[PDB]
């Protein structure tokens, strides 16, 4: 389901994989709240990408 959500995100947000992989910064989940991908789908991605995040979370 997460992979299909990723495909659906790529449908709208475009090729955001490079943007996601480049703006790494610091880890939000460890074994923090330091979110770094907010505004990634600000103009086009939006809900799909948000859903994608949720799924992978």
């Amino acid at each position: 389901e997460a992979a299909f959500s990723l495909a659906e995100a790529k449908f709208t947000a475009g090729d955001f994989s490079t943007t996601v992989i480049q703006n790494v910064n610091k880890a939000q989940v460890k074994i923090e709240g330091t979110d770094s991908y907010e505004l990634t789908g600000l103009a086009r991605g939006g809900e799909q990408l948000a859903k994608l995040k949720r799924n992978y979370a």
């Binding site: 992989i21 790494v24 910064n25 610091k26 880890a27």
Partner: peptide
């Protein structure tokens, strides 16, 4: 993801 002190990705 995170870049450590050596900037090494995980």
């Amino acid at each position: 993801g995170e870049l450590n002190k050596n900037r090494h990705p995980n």
